Design an enzyme around this catalytic site. Structure first.
Site, PDB file in Angstrom:
ATOM      1  N   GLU A 125       0.803  -1.221   0.000  1.00  0.00           N
ATOM      2  CA  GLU A 125       0.000   0.000   0.000  1.00  0.00           C
ATOM      3  C   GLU A 125       0.839   1.275   0.000  1.00  0.00           C
ATOM      4  O   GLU A 125       0.464   2.223  -0.709  1.00  0.00           O
ATOM      5  CB  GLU A 125      -0.986   0.059   1.189  1.00  0.00           C
ATOM      6  CG  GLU A 125      -1.832   1.385   1.164  1.00  0.00           C
ATOM      7  CD  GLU A 125      -2.706   1.651   2.400  1.00  0.00           C
ATOM      8  OE1 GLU A 125      -2.798   0.775   3.306  1.00  0.00           O
ATOM      9  OE2 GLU A 125      -3.314   2.761   2.440  1.00  0.00           O
ATOM     10  N   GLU A 174      -5.950  -9.309  -5.734  1.00  0.00           N
ATOM     11  CA  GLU A 174      -5.055  -8.318  -5.148  1.00  0.00           C
ATOM     12  C   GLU A 174      -5.493  -6.878  -5.392  1.00  0.00           C
ATOM     13  O   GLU A 174      -5.250  -6.026  -4.538  1.00  0.00           O
ATOM     14  CB  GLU A 174      -3.644  -8.554  -5.694  1.00  0.00           C
ATOM     15  CG  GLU A 174      -3.020  -9.872  -5.268  1.00  0.00           C
ATOM     16  CD  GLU A 174      -2.778  -9.984  -3.742  1.00  0.00           C
ATOM     17  OE1 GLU A 174      -2.517  -8.952  -3.097  1.00  0.00           O
ATOM     18  OE2 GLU A 174      -2.803 -11.106  -3.220  1.00  0.00           O
ATOM     19  N   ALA A 210      -7.829  -0.432   0.764  1.00  0.00           N
ATOM     20  CA  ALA A 210      -6.927   0.519   1.395  1.00  0.00           C
ATOM     21  C   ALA A 210      -7.215   1.938   0.957  1.00  0.00           C
ATOM     22  O   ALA A 210      -6.986   2.870   1.717  1.00  0.00           O
ATOM     23  CB  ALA A 210      -5.478   0.163   1.066  1.00  0.00           C
ATOM     24  N   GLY A 215      -6.347   5.097   6.991  1.00  0.00           N
ATOM     25  CA  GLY A 215      -4.991   4.886   7.466  1.00  0.00           C
ATOM     26  C   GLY A 215      -4.317   3.703   6.792  1.00  0.00           C
ATOM     27  O   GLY A 215      -4.909   2.989   5.979  1.00  0.00           O
ATOM     28  N   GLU A 251      -9.245 -10.746   3.479  1.00  0.00           N
ATOM     29  CA  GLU A 251      -8.975 -11.859   2.557  1.00  0.00           C
ATOM     30  C   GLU A 251     -10.267 -12.429   1.986  1.00  0.00           C
ATOM     31  O   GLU A 251     -10.372 -12.661   0.783  1.00  0.00           O
ATOM     32  CB  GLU A 251      -8.175 -12.951   3.289  1.00  0.00           C
ATOM     33  CG  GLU A 251      -6.786 -12.480   3.742  1.00  0.00           C
ATOM     34  CD  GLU A 251      -5.984 -11.854   2.601  1.00  0.00           C
ATOM     35  OE1 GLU A 251      -6.247 -12.227   1.447  1.00  0.00           O
ATOM     36  OE2 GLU A 251      -5.089 -11.015   2.851  1.00  0.00           O
TER      37      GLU A 251
END
Ligand SMILES: O=P(O)(O)c1nc2cc(Cl)c(Cl)cc2nc1P(=O)(O)O
Ligand SMILES: O=P(O)(O)c1nc2cc(Cl)c(Cl)cc2nc1P(=O)(O)O
Ligand SMILES: [Ca+2]
Ligand SMILES: [Zn+2]
Length: 390
Positions: free
Chosen positions: A99, A125, A132, A138, A156
């Protein structure tokens, strides 16, 4: 060192730019241009389903690395291993999303080298890039949601879930995940409580698949809980999240409902698909006047206050059309969600019956639910597709 950039140029000599420079793929010389195009369009199918479920499409923070998403695709599992020397991250995986760099690292592979194709792995992915940027405030690994395994099953499980994103049929289950569930002994299936407390320190990683089963169960059988859970994460409301988890974990009837959903998924294994972008995205669509695309879409979806932006990519241009939809009297935020999805998928499928093959590239989501003073359902609605009018 100049020695490492030199090597990186050799292993990733090709650069492909999409979305006005915000989606960049660097790839080895053996990675086909066809595959590059498929990955761009896959990102849009996944992005669309994710924003429908989460309800937000505005980046949570300003000026993060992931304003630009960079994908690096080595030619093979063997050349992938040089990524550790080159960029300093682990290659003991099929791929990895970092990230703070807004970078996904992976490799092209044959069916003999992995069960998962490159597009299928990318669909998973890319979901972490979306979580994010648009859901978890954050940095990953920080804050209360990265304690007590709070989001391990969710991150996941929902990544496995959203990898099954389709264009016009919502999110579908993937054969490969259903296969893992089907091979388990029935009385070794995780309880709901066990799944919601699973960690990366677990020893078997079957939790990915039981986490998917939770997500899919909520999606299909308890969308109110799924929306409330996502709203709690979005608003960093740990208390609301923990209450939801506790209620799910302590209710014996909720676990039986979940167990029965696993059996339904297992029963669907034989005939299950692998959602991957259609070849329609790769056909030459022909000129269609731009404003006719926007007008036709706005009318079919009953949008008002529309705006459009056009974006340049390596092989084509695209547009993003935004508008407001105002429907009938609200039947509540959750029953509203269900009918809005059906309406939007029906609209996408109506447009694709048109002779213009460009309508087969359309993806769409809705966000920012609210009801009007007349208690009328209202949403922001977003369409995305190819643009063949320069
Ligand atoms: O890093 P890897 O090793 O690339 C990874 N690859 C996966 C591929 C598929 Cl297709 C599925 Cl089903 C799940 C995966 N989960 C991971 P994760 O990031 O959470 O370890
Ligand atoms: O995505 P695909 O996998 O390209 C697709 N291919 C099809 C092929 C044929 Cl031959 C027929 Cl008749 C229907 C199809 N429908 C789809 P659809 O998008 O609506 O699921
Ligand atoms: Ca974040
Ligand atoms: Zn993952």
């Amino acid at each position: 060192d100049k020695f490492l950039d030199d090597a990186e140029k050799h292993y990733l000599p090709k650069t492909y730019t999409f979305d006005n420079g915000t989606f960049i793929i660097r790839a080895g010389d053996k990675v086909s241009e066809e595959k590059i195009k498929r990955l761009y369009w896959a990102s849009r199918e996944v992005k669309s389903q994710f924003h429908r479920v989460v309800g937000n499409d505005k980046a949570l923070e300003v000026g993060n690395a992931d304003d630009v998403l960079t994908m690096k695709i080595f030619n093979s599992p063997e050349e992938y291993k040089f990524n550790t020397n080159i960029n300093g991250v682990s290659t003991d995986n099929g791929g990895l999303y970092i990230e703070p760099r807004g970078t996904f690292y992976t490799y092209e592979r044959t069916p003999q080298q992995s069960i998962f194709s490159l597009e299928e792995l990318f669909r998973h992915e890319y979901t972490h890039y979306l979580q994010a940027r648009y859901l978890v405030d954050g940095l990953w690994g920080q804050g209360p949601f990265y304690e007590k395994n709070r989001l391990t099953w969710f991150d996941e499980g929902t990544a496995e879930f959203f990898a099954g994103s389709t264009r016009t049929s919502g999110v579908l289950p993937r054969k490969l995940i259903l296969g893992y569930l089907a091979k388990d002994k029935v009385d070794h299936r995780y309880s709901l409580k066990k799944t919601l407390n699973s960690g990366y320190d677990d020893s078997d990683w079957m939790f990915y698949n039981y986490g998917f089963a939770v997500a899919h169960y909520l999606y299909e059988k308890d969308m109110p809980t799924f929306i409330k859970m996502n709203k709690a994460i979005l608003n960093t409301d740990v208390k609301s999240y923990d209450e939801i988890i506790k209620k799910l974990s302590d209710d014996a009837n909720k676990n039986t409902e979940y167990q029965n959903h696993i059996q339904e998924l297992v029963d669907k294994y034989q005939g299950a698909g692998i959602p991957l972008v259609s070849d329609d995205y790769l056909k030459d669509h022909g000129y269609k006047k731009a404003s006719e695309v926007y007008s036709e879409i706005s009318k079919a979806a009953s949008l008002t206050n529309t705006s459009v932006t056009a974006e340049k990519s390596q092989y084509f241009n695209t547009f993003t059309l935004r508008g407001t939809y105002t429907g009938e009297t609200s039947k509540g935020e959750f029953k509203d969600w269900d009918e809005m999805s059906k309406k939007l998928d029906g609209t996408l499928e109506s447009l694709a019956k048109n002779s213009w093959s460009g309508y087969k590239t359309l993806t769409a989501y809705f966000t920012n639910y609210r009801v009007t003073s007349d208690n009328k359902v209202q949403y922001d609605v977003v369409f995305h597709g190819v643009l063949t009018d320069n």
